């Protein structure tokens, strides 16, 4: 339930071939970038870096929670349906 990860803006690459070695069974790769994750503090700056290095960027906008009204006392209500059968 931690929220010190949903603070940054991260740049990753699409994935690529990731097969199994025949000798023992490890996982190899033809691409070096697969594990190149980069940090940023702003979408504008990230976009600047991306379009600067020339790649083709695609965004995933921010999914932010909503605010809610937790009138605890409601659990112990009279007319409502919220009334729980537990404690």
């Amino acid at each position: 339930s931690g929220v010190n990860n949903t603070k940054k803006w991260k740049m990753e690459f699409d994935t690529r071939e990731r097969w199994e070695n025949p000798l023992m069974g490890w996982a190899s790769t033809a691409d070096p970038l697969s594990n190149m994750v980069l940090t940023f503090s702003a979408k504008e700056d990230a976009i600047a870096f991306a379009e600067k290095n020339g790649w083709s960027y695609d965004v995933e906008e921010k999914k932010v929670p909503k605010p809610k009204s937790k009138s605890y006392g409601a659990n112990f209500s009279w007319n409502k349906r919220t009334r729980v059968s537990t404690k």
Binding site: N79, R83, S85
Partner: protein
């Protein structure tokens, strides 16, 4: 003088409920939450 509350030595294990059953004729109608139940 002498202890007086000796009218329960014969109170079996049903008297409270028999009394409730009798009083339920003298009680008043309980309020209605306008509902079946909160489920």
């Amino acid at each position: 003088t002498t202890y007086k509350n000796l009218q329960h030595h014969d109170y079996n294990t049903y008297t409270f409920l028999d009394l409730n059953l009798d009083l339920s004729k003298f009680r008043l109608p309980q309020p209605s939450s306008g509902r079946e139940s909160p489920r």
